[PDB]
Amino acid sequence: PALTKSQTDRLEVLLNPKDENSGKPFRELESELLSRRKKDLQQIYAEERENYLGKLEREITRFFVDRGFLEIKSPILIPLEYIERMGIDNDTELSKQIFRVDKNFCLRPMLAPNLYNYLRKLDRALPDPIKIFEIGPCYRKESDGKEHLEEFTMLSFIQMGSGCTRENLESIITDFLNHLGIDFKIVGGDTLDVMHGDLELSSAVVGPIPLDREWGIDKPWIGAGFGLERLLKVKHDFKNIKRAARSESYYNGISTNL
Amino acid sequence: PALTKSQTDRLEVLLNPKDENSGKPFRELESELLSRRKKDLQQIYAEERENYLGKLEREITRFFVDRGFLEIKSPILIPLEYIERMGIDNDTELSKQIFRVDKNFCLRPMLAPNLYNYLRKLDRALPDPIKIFEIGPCYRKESDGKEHLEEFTMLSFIQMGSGCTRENLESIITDFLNHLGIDFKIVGGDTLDVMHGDLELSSAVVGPIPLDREWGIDKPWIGAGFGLERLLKVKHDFKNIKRAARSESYYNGISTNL
Ligand SMILES: Nc1ncnc2c1ncn2[C@@H]1O[C@H](COP(=O)(O)OP(=O)(O)OP(=O)(O)O)[C@@H](O)[C@H]1O
Ligand SMILES: Nc1ncnc2c1ncn2[C@@H]1O[C@H](COP(=O)(O)OP(=O)(O)OP(=O)(O)O)[C@@H](O)[C@H]1O
Ligand SMILES: N[C@@H](Cc1cccc(I)c1)C(=O)O
Ligand SMILES: N[C@@H](Cc1cccc(I)c1)C(=O)O
Ligand SMILES: [Mg+2]
Ligand SMILES: [Mg+2]
Ligand SMILES: [Mg+2]
Ligand SMILES: [Mg+2]
Ligand SMILES: [Mg+2]
Ligand SMILES: [Mg+2]
C-alpha cells in the first residue's frame, strides 16, 4: 500500500538531493537508500576525509587572508556585559535568545563585540585600513528549526578606516559568493541583507553607527556576518539546515543512522 | 631606581621569548617593547595574516586526514547525560569542572562522548579499521592559570578495530609530535601520558575499557587527546598559556594592549 508518513520521514532522512510512489515497498526503498548512503560515506573515507563545515571554514579563511584580512580567533564564552553593551536590551528579540553561563558569562550570539574590541586595539598598531575577520561557533535559542540552528557558525569580516564604502562592501560580498558558487541578491548607517531566495545568508552594515562610540570606535567601517551552515545548505541543496550542522546525526549531509 | 613589581609585570606582558636590570628607566623599556610588538603585528598583517591557533588546527587536520583519519565536527553544546554516561560521577574531579547550560546541556569538557557515538554509527558503514579525529573547543572550570584555560581546544583521534596496539598508538603520537617539532616523552587498559618536561600534552588510552559497553562499543581501540594551546605554548615557548588562547588580550602571543 501507500507509504506511511513515518516511513516517508525515514526515507527522507536517507534521501540526498539528486538521488532519484512506486510498486516498491518501504523495506526495499529503505534498503536501497541505506546502501547508497553507506557508499557515500565509504567514498569520503577512501578519498578526501574532510568535513564540509571544517572545509568551508578553511576555504573562507583562505579567501579573506588572501584579500588582506587578519584571521582572528577570539573567545566563544564572553562576558554577559558585552550583550548589553551591544545595545541588546530586553526590547530586542535577541535578549531572549542568549544562552547564559554562570553569573557573568554567555555563549556569544554573534562575533561583533569581540571584533569591536580587536578593531580598537589593533588601530594602535596597524596601518589604515584595518581589515579583520573571524569564523567560529555562535549560539542562539531559536524556536524555528528549518533555517535556524541553536549552535551555528558565523563568518564576520570588517574593514575600518579608508575605503569603507557601500560599493566596496557589496564588491567583497559579490566576489566572495561568486567564489563559493552561491547565487544571491543584495537587498537594501546602511543595512543590507544578502538573500538566497527567501533565505538570509548575511546581514551587512555600512558604518559608522552610533553604537561604535560605546566600543571606542570613531572611524568609518564596513562589515558583514554570514552563517556557514546556511551557505552549506544552499551550496549542497540540503532541504533542512540540520544536514549542515555540527551533528551526531549527519555527516557531510549524510545520515549517520544507517 | 629599581623597577616596581607592577612595572615588571607590564614589561613581561610586552616581552616575547627571545627579546633581550639596567640604567634604563621603565618608560624607555616600555616604549622599546611597545615598538617591537607593534612591528611584530605589522609584519603578521603584511605577510601571513594567520592566527596561530587556527593555523595549528589546519596543520593538525592535514596530518590526520593524510594518515587516513576522517575529520569530525560534532556539537560543542552536548547533553548533560553524556557526562554521567562517561562515568564522570560526583566522585571524580571533572564533575566539579562542568559548565552547565540550561537544564539539560553543558559545554563539552572533552571530545570522547561524541566520538564514541561516531565510532558506533560509522562501524555500520565503514571498513575496518575505523579512524576518526576531531579538533575543537572544550571547556573546564579550572583554579589554576598557568597551564590551564577554562576555554581550550582539544585534538582527539581514535582508531578502532584492527591494528589497535600500544605500539601503533605510540607511533602515531611520535610521528605527530616530530612533525610539529615538539619535544616529548611518553610516560606509562593502558593509560599513557605524553609529557613535555612537567607539562602534560596528552592523555592517551589503549582500549578496550569497560566504559566502552555503555556506548555500544565492543572492539579494540587506541586514541589520544591533546591540548592545542599547550602545543602552541611549548612550540612558541610562551611562559603563560594565555598567550596561546582564544583571547582579546593576545594575538599570536603578542599583547594587544599596546
Ligand atoms: N540561528 C541561526 N542558525 C543558523 N544561522 C544563523 C542563525 N542566526 C543567524 N545566522 C546567520 O548569521 C548571519 C548574521 O546574523 P544575524 O544576527 O544577521 O541573523 P538574523 O538576522 O537573526 O537571521 P534570521 O532573520 O534568519 O533569524 C545571518 O544572516 C544568518 O546567516
Ligand atoms: N583546562 C585546560 N586547559 C588547556 N588544556 C587542557 C585543559 N584540560 C585538558 N587540556 C589538554 O587536553 C588533554 C586531554 O585532556 P585530559 O582530560 O587528559 O586533561 P587533564 O589530565 O585533566 O590535564 P591536567 O592534568 O593538566 O589537568 C590534556 O593532556 C591537556 O593537554
Ligand atoms: N548583524 C550581523 C552581521 C554583521 C553585520 C555588520 C557587522 C558585523 I562584524 C556583522 C551580526 O553580527 O549578527
Ligand atoms: N582522556 C583524554 C584524552 C583521551 C584519551 C583517550 C581517548 C580519547 I578520544 C581522548 C580526554 O578525552 O579528556
Ligand atoms: Mg534571528
Ligand atoms: Mg533577519
Ligand atoms: Mg540579519
Ligand atoms: Mg585537569
Ligand atoms: Mg592529568
Ligand atoms: Mg590527562
Q: Answer whether B101 sits within 8 Å of A99, measured CB to CB.
A: yes
CATH 1.10.287.540 in chain B: give the residue spans.
1-49
* CA gap B192, B173 in Å, rounded: 11
Alpha helices (H) in B3-110, listed in sequence order: 5-14, 26-46, 52-66, 81-85
* CA gap A95, A84 in Å, rounded: 9
Count Cβ neighbours within 10 Å for each residue of A27-36 and write b for 16 or more, e otherwise. Answer: eebeeebbee
Burial of B198 (0-12, 13-18, 19+ CB in 10 A): exposed
Cα of B105 from ligand 6 centre, angstroms: 26
CATH 3.30.930.10 in chain A: give the residue spans.
50-258
- Axis-axis angle for helices A5-14, A26-46 (nearest 10): 20
CATH fourth-level superfamily of B50-258: Bira Bifunctional Protein; Domain 2 (3.30.930.10)
Q: Which of B12, B10, B258 is nearest to A122 (CA)?
A: B258
Cell reading at A123: 588601530
CA dihedral over B119, B120, B123, B128, signed as positive or negative: positive
Burial of B191 (0-12, 13-18, 19+ CB in 10 A): exposed
Please name the residue whose Cα sits nearest to atom 5 of ligand 1: A227
How many CA atoms within 13 Å lie on the side-chain side of B172?
A: 29
Q: Which position has the grid cell 551587512?
A: A204
Q: Answer whether A151 sits within 8 Å of B101, measured CB to CB.
A: no
What does the CA dihedral A17, A19, A24, A28 come to, rounded to 10 degrees? Answer: -100
B37 CA: distance to closest CA in chain A (Å): 8
Q: Answer whether B126 sits within 8 Å of A61, measured CB to CB.
A: no
Count Cβ neighbours within 10 Å for each residue of B214-232 and write b for 16 or more, e otherwise. Answer: ebebebbbbbbbbbbbbbb
Q: Which of A94, A156, A160, A211 to mutate to test ligand 3, by most ligand atoms within 8 A of the CB atom?
A: A156
Count Cβ neighbours within 10 Å for each residue of B83-96 and write b for 16 or more, e otherwise. Answer: beebebeeeeebee
Query: Which residue in chain A is spatially nearest to B106 when comparing CA positions?
Result: A101
CA distances B183 to B43, B151, B170, B173, B253, Å, are 28, 25, 14, 11, 20
Q: Return the CATH number of the domain spanning residue range A1-49.
A: 1.10.287.540
* CA gap B251, B233 in Å, rounded: 13
Q: Which of B170, B132, B47, B54 is nearest to A41 (CA)?
A: B132
